[PDB]
Amino acid sequence: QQGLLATPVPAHARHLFFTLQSPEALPAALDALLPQVDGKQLLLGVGAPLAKALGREIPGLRPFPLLDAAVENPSTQHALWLWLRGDERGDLLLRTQALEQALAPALSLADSVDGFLHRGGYDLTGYEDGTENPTDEEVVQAAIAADGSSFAAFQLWKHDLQYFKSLPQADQDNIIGRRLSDNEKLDDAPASAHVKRTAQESFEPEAFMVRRSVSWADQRGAGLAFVALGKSFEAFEVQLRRMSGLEDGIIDGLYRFSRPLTGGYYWCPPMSETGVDLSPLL
Amino acid sequence: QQGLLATPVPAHARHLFFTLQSPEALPAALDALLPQVDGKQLLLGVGAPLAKALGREIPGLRPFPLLDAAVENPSTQHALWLWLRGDERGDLLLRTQALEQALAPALSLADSVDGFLHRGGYDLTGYEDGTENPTDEEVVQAAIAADGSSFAAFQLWKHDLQYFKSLPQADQDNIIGRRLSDNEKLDDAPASAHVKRTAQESFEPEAFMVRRSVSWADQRGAGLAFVALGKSFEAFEVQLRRMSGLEDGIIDGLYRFSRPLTGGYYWCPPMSETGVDLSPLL
Amino acid sequence: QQGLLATPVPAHARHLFFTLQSPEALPAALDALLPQVDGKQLLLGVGAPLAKALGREIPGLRPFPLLDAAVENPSTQHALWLWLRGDERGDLLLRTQALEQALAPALSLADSVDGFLHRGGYDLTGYEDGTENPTDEEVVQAAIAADGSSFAAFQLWKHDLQYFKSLPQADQDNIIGRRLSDNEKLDDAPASAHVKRTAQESFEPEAFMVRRSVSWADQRGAGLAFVALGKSFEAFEVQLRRMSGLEDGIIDGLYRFSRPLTGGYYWCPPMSETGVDLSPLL
Amino acid sequence: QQGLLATPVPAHARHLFFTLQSPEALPAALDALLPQVDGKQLLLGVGAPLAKALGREIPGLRPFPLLDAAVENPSTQHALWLWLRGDERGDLLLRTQALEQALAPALSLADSVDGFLHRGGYDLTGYEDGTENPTDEEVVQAAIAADGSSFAAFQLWKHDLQYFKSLPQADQDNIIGRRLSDNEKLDDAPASAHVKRTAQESFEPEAFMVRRSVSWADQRGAGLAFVALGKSFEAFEVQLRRMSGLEDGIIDGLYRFSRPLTGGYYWCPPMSETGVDLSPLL
Numbered sequence A, B, C, D: 001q002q003g004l005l006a007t008p009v010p011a012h013a014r015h016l017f018f019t020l021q022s023p024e025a026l027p028a029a030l031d032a033l034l035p036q037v038d039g040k041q042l043l044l045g046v047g048a049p050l051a052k053a054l055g056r057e058i059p060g061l062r063p064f065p066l067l068d069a070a071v072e073n074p075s076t077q078h079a080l081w082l083w084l085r086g087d088e089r090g091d092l093l094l095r096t097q098a099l100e101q102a103l104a105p106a107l108s109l110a111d112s113v114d115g116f117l118h119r120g121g122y123d124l125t126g127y128e129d130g131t132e133n134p135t136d137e138e139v140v141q142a143a144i145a146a147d148g149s150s151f152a153a154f155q156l157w158k159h160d161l162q163y164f165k166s167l168p169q170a171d172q173d174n175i176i177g178r179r180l181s182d183n184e185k186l187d188d189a190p191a192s193a194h195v196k197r198t199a200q201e202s203f204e205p206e207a208f209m210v211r212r213s214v215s216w217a218d219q220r221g222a223g224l225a226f227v228a229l230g231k232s233f234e235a236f237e238v239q240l241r242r243m244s245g246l247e248d249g250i251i252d253g254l255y256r257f258s259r260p261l262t263g264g265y266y267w268c269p270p271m272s273e274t275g276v277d278l279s280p281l282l
């Protein structure tokens, strides 16, 4: 298993997404990338088109779903995902440039996210995200599968901070479901509150998930880079359909000030005694 | 019917895409937008989430499909599409700013494309696109349905012009399927050639489509804003699955230098005697 | 003389600015650029640092001035200026990419402007700019010097169209100095009106200038790409100091909704019988 | 005196630059800005156009100079400079948005720089900048004037890291003047080496300066946000003219891979017992 759960998470992150355009050059790119995948500073996630391009099908791996709902959750599935973690923001910028060159011409950089951990684990709106994460011994049970693989879901949410912060504090709390002044759950908030929509125990058959989100800021705006780890995509997909109003006509309140710009499913390979284990994909 | 087929197409275009975030303000936005939808200078297309948000389901309208293939065709379905056509590039920039304000706060601008018709109907690579479009009397038959509605598919393709133009002229012709020097079909080009993949008569049960694409240039790069009109999405979707290698393991050659950045299905409402006919959606 | 005065001006323009960073490669770049400088589709202007890097000083050529005033006129002097004119917007985008490669590594692209002529010669605010340009036989007298050279001043003004158009029509007319409804001069507009500040006959010793501005739109916003030709920079510099409030404490009204982002002086070489004449610079 | 010299410098910075466009609203903006200027987390610097707009002239304050040289040092003088320092990158992004709103409509944001201290005080090229800064007791003598004011010079340098790092390590060391492997001065490096050009003791009449630069990364690229404090601009201006080749025809080697994009002079007001002292400007 990689270090998708190590605490504390470094102060900065960098999410890279690549499109496979020259498959004949892929062996040369993998021979220079895999010796660097340590699982702690550089994490790897295989996307559905990369498995499909190699003809081998990975169990549980599939593209980001298409949700015919009243809210827009885009499916921007890419072939490869590189998760860079580190305290030095400049070192992550230098390494992503080195990774971008070593992967060409097989993989072209399709998306990049300059992430940072805001106030140890707070969203830019001030609300502490990650409060209801499973305990340190429940995390491995909920995020890791049998082989040691994890199935991660990424979503780049763009916030309208000027609009959300202009609303009264009661309206902001009813959207999140928690008080900003003390992080206490509003037990009588509307069912459209985010914590009401995503109450992990409210889903009768489904289980929990391990979130590893960070904040971001670009020319595209700012918001939260949502990361959800789990032994399968079932925990995340039942949540997103619940938030989108598919389980019942109630739409999550987050969609009033924030909307996801990207979305993808990526299978995180296990860590063997010799680097990252991509043997099932050969 | 709107003016989706009028010839000649103006020298400039502007494609606007909106996300519905404040549905309570939608009646105020529609009362200022619909009197402007003339069908010739301003065209309208309803997206699946907009029909789903109103509870009324439009026959044939559905989100952009998810294609589990070795190539990436993103599904960036939005709620509303505004197609602006005109010869004055500055007038289209002034009008999109006026449309952006009149639609707030019900609809927020999610995507915008500054389009232009390059050399009367040529792609930036120099290849004449639109040669095999149906004749002027076959267009209405292939693009318009029974009621007068059309089902359009939009895709923002980003070109790597520095890479495509660096290849030898024979390699460039084998990717397109036509000679650049005379627009003649290479009858012995690989089946992965774009004209070989999209031979409208090669699809045994399916029909044709009416393309109305234009070129674009942004900070995101440059390429082709692909527009495909038809009486249904069946003509376009069978083409894209063919290009993606789903019908047979042959992937279109366009994916070696170009990749789509967006993708959406939009139902174009008919034109009654009093403006645009959105009666089925009420 | 080049074609800096040809009427009508093409519907699109492209202004390229280069910084000289590898001077040892300059001879290789000039041998591929000068055979293309026709004066009509591709115009050239030498900047002060390029003349200073070659040790030869051109009479009249100097960097864009520094105006210690209450308004900001930046001095973004570059080494080389390429003025591309043409009706096909896509052809100008393809040619600037070819010019960018042929000039490397001697000259790196420092700035680029995608310009268009709005409504034949109107500013995005609707006001017709170029009404008081000298007549077709006075233009050569006011723009061309003895040898056939012209001294051009470039300024990239960024408009706040949302603010200017929100003001009442009387306030907008008092800023420009002309009525928007009929392009008639407001003889009792404040002296801070743009036409009052730039009345070419109000400058007692100075002469006129020939303007060749176009509109632009970028990720930086939109506005006017101001071009002022003349037999010397004296006509333009006395205007800008007048607008900045240096001649008298009255500041031009344009600075309330627009501000220049760049600024540079460039000497346009004459056209001999064999291409562009850069002989004085050798 | 403000906290322009406090050690250690926080891990992140944010430089904001404003243009005065609505001077009638300036009193309302100052009454909300000055109570926040603490000198440690929020620093303030007055530009020449702001002093000129108020009619009061500050001794020593003048716009960024115009250097007629073979290299381009732009003069992008603005009216107001806000220097935000803090360890939380997200808090600086939230505060710059609050400062941007409280300053409107008097001051519009003209430029913004998201800065970070790379590896405690290293440039993105790996070279330790700030080694030859004056000692902790020489800093106040070299940076602070009689009243407690400081005169700062800002320059946004954009690096070509892909080009500088492609050169051999000996070429990179000859440009900087120090070995990358041990930060030791190359006593026989060319006079065009940056440390050879900027040897603080080589300037016979002039003194030293206190640098407080940080690294940056934007859509414009990446590089160093150069900050030079001093009791006057004489120390910095004699350096820049030396680097530009004005003192002798030797041009600094930094201009081969990096070029400044902005440039401005700003007078830092002293700190009285009641906030920032802007009394001379009234």
Ligand code: HEM
Residues within 6 Å of the ligand: A123, A127, A128, A129, A130, A131, A132, A133, A155, A157, A176, A178, A194, A195, A198, A199, A200, A201, A209, A224, A226, A228, A236, A239, A240, A243, A254, A258
């Ligand atoms: C803009 C996007 C998002 C924001 C601002 C956000 C913010 C928050 C906040 C502040 C909390 C409260 C912390 C806690 O109760 O532990 C929370 C809880 C949670 N969120 Fe999100 N979140 C976002 C996206 C998502 C998405 C898309 C999902 C799932 C598809 C998700 C899943 C969860 C879960 C499972 C919880 C735990 C709540 C509980 O167990 O009671 N989050 N989120």
Ligand code: HEM
Residues within 6 Å of the ligand: B123, B127, B128, B129, B130, B131, B132, B133, B155, B157, B176, B178, B194, B195, B198, B199, B200, B201, B209, B224, B226, B228, B236, B239, B240, B243, B254, B258
């Ligand atoms: C970067 C994207 C694209 C480029 C550069 C491009 C370019 C071209 C060119 C140069 C032709 C030859 C003109 C002709 O034979 O009429 C052509 C034909 C055609 N294209 Fe595309 N195209 C693109 C995307 C698409 C897509 C995504 C589809 C369908 C899903 C499509 C459908 C067609 C069809 C139906 C034809 C007619 C070919 C025939 O009937 O023989 N195009 N395209």
Ligand code: HEM
Residues within 6 Å of the ligand: C123, C127, C128, C129, C130, C131, C132, C133, C155, C157, C176, C178, C194, C195, C198, C199, C200, C201, C209, C224, C226, C228, C236, C239, C240, C243, C254, C258
């Ligand atoms: C945002 C920037 C600018 C805008 C929107 C603008 C717009 C206009 C307009 C609408 C006119 C009236 C047309 C006419 O009277 O011929 C005009 C006139 C003129 N402008 Fe500008 N202009 C700008 C910048 C400048 C600058 C910076 C200068 C000189 C330094 C300049 C020089 C002139 C001159 C000489 C005239 C002729 C007025 C006369 O002779 O009565 N323009 N401008």
Ligand code: HEM
Residues within 6 Å of the ligand: D123, D127, D128, D129, D130, D131, D132, D133, D155, D157, D176, D178, D194, D195, D198, D199, D200, D201, D209, D224, D226, D228, D236, D239, D240, D243, D254, D258
């Ligand atoms: C891209 C821009 C720049 C880079 C990468 C850079 C980098 C460096 C480095 C690595 C050093 C060696 C550290 C040391 O000796 O203390 C240095 C020294 C120095 N730099 Fe820069 N610098 C830049 C811009 C400037 C500018 C524009 C100036 C002045 C106008 C300046 C003034 C100095 C001074 C005074 C020293 C001290 C050298 C000595 O006293 O021996 N720097 N710089």
